[model samples]
Target: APKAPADGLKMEATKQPVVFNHSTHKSVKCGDCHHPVNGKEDYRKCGTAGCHDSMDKKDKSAKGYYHVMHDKNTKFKSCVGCHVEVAGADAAKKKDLTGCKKSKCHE
Candidate 1:
């Protein structure tokens, strides 16, 4: 269901809310981000009920909000995982995407 998404899809999974652009990631496969449900790749929001809605970072489940964003242990790529590689030697962009505060990621 790669519905031509809007340009500014603001997601508030975290307090700061990240403004993600599907077009920016248009090169990547959809399943890479959407989890495969029972024979179907679910496109529901990451923080949807019964999904990665665990507000507690201590939960440790790959489904937790904070954990899933940086939980690189799993097969799927986290925001940080790809960004670090994408950032490469560009420390400035890396710092912005990886930084918690005072960066381009949050708030």
Candidate 2:
């Protein structure tokens, strides 16, 4: 998916997780950042845009606007889903938390 617009908007609408380094992923192979989506490679359409437009209030996949602003118990919170920092390892050392979001972008 094409990423969200870089232009400033509302906090929840504008903020996005860390951008993935594409060149690096290419060298490493598509599987580095991509996983099977309906049994197909899925990096071309990421969670940032299209079906995952969290800013769109009517978009069912959006989980509502409040899901973007608050740290509620939801599936939207995860590095594998969104956000930048990788949990349980290297950079951010975040816990493997499936619910509750924690990141600077939201603030």
Candidate 3:
């Protein structure tokens, strides 16, 4: 079984509940997502105020905060991007397979 975060934290989203396995990503040093804890801190929620604030994708702009943060060509890149990199680099690389498809990150 995967060891969950020390805080026993979980993210409840529209589709699935994400268990933040702090142990699994303890080595990840990207401050883009995992902000400082003591010396630093995560902004808490994604769509919260001052965080990702909006989900609107109006005209002239083809993407919203959702895609802007999680897109393949943006800052920090998408969650799927990291997953693919890790999965491909791991001992189990498969054709046409993605981290979302291979794991329980999503439903």
Give the number of the best model, judged by lDDT: 1
Instruction: Tell me model 1's lDDT, rounded to 2 decimals.
Output: 0.78
User: lDDT of each prediction vs. the true structure?
Assistant: 0.78, 0.42, 0.52
Model 2 backbone overlap count = 3
Better of 1 and 3 by TM-score: 1
Q: Report the candidate with higher lDDT, 1 versus 3.
A: 1
For residues 1-101, write the lDDT of model 1, one tens digit per residue: 76868888887756668888878888888888885878788998888998888899788776688877776676678887777778888879877877777
Off by over 4 Å in 2: 1-13, 22-32, 47-50, 56-77, 80-107
Kindly list the per-residue Cα lDDT of model 2 for residues 3-97, writing each as its tens digit.
43444433333445333334433334444445455677575544355534566544444344434433334443423333333343544534322
Rank order by TM-score, top first? 1, 3, 2
- TM-score against native, each model: 0.83, 0.32, 0.56
- Model 3, range 13-34, lDDT digits (tens) per residue? 3345555556666777546465
Whole-model alpha-carbon lDDT for candidate 2: 0.42
Please give the range of 10 consecutive residues that has the lowest summed lDDT in model 1.
98-107
